[PDB]
């Protein structure tokens, strides 16, 4: 089997992307966050908090046919970004672009954090890390594309992000037609449950290439890419005027200027990130102070590849019993 289906920003920006996941008999279809750097599917649900609930679209399990308690089963999830939630479980049908699993662990949200009220265009999450970091308790339970790997063609799940526009998630087949060149494929670590890889290196603008090896994460779920001090200082120093401010949180530079590219290294391949996916506009609505895209990783704990990176790319998350990452240009 197979399954395709295209993700949405959620907003101007490419904070985040959205993709339609059907839920339950009859469908109830919600969009989610697809995460792979969480190993939860975790929905906004009949059973949240009704101050709670700001817009989305709901899950109602007492109205899908299929729906069963996973009697004694919680969860609550913490996630980087400081932002949290927590609920029981049931279990549903679970389809994403035509491909469906039964028996999935849905988390029902009893409570959100206030990022996620806050956000009427996100649904839910769909986490599609390692499953050995599923919250659950106290059964540990898989991931969408765990349960739905043996089905699967091929063990692989690939991420098209799009810059200012949809992309693509398919499960169960590489579509050739999607990039340009050749994937280069690199070794991954599940230690600690992500999709764990080194870079060769990195690069800024039309700059010599530095190699050296960064150990990192591929993270759909989070927004900017974040590097080490080094690299992100050497990024910054290249675009007059910008500083990093503690009061707004990060790197800012003024809205007036014409950002460089930034390359980072898979093997002896090479990915360039456009400057213009490194700006994140205003920091408040008419500032003249734009904020960046690549930020430090310093006091995070790992440097995380996060979307401003990945949409550069084709990306193969590749679940085979070694599993492996594959990036290409697009």
Do not use: M
């Not at 339950?24 to 009949?46: E, H, I, M, R, Y």
């Not at 603008?205 to 779920?221: H, L, R, V």
């Not at 996060?306 to 679940?319: E, M, Q, R, S, T």
């Amino acid at each position: 089997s197979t399954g395709s289906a295209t993700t949405t920003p959620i907003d101007s920006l490419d904070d985040a992307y959205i993709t339609p996941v059907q839920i339950g008999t009859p469908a109830q279809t919600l969009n989610l966050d697809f995460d792979t750097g969480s190993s939860d599917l975790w929905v906004f649900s009949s059973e949240t908090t009704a101050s709670e609930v700001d817009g989305q679209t709901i899950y109602t399990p007492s109205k899908s046919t299929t729906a069963k308690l996973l009697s004694g089963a919680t969860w609550s999830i913490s996630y980087g970004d400081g932002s949290s939630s927590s609920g029981d479980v049931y279990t549903d049908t679970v389809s994403v672009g035509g491909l469906t699993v039964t028996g999935q662990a849905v988390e029902s949200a009893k409570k959100v954090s206030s990022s996620f009220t806050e956000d009427s265009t996100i649904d839910g999450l769909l986490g599609l890390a390692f499953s050995t970091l599923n919250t659950v308790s106290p059964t540990q339970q898989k991931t969408f594309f765990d349960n739905a790997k043996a089905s699967l063609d091929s063990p692989v799940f690939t991420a098209d992000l799009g810059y200012h526009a949809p992309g693509t998630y398919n499960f169960g087949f590489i579509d050739t037609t999607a990039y340009t060149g050749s994937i280069t494929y690199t070794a991954v670590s599940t230690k600690q449950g992500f999709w764990e890889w080194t870079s060769t290196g990195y690069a800024v603008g039309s700059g010599t290439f530095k190699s050296t090896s960064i150990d990192g994460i591929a993270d759909t779920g989070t927004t900017l890419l974040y590097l080490p001090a080094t690299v992100v200082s050497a990024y910054w120093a290249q675009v007059s005027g910008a500083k990093s401010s503690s009061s707004v949180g990060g790197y800012v530079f003024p809205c007036s200027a014409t950002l460089p590219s930034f390359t980072f290294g898979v093997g002896s391949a090479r990915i360039v990130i456009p400057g213009d996916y490194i700006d994140f506009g205003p920091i408040s609505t008419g500032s003249s102070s734009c904020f960046g895209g690549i930020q430090s990783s310093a006091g995070i704990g790992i440097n995380i590849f996060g979307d401003v990176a990945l949409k550069a790319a084709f990306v193969v998350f590749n679940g085979a019993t070694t599993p492996t990452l594959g990036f290409a240009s697009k």
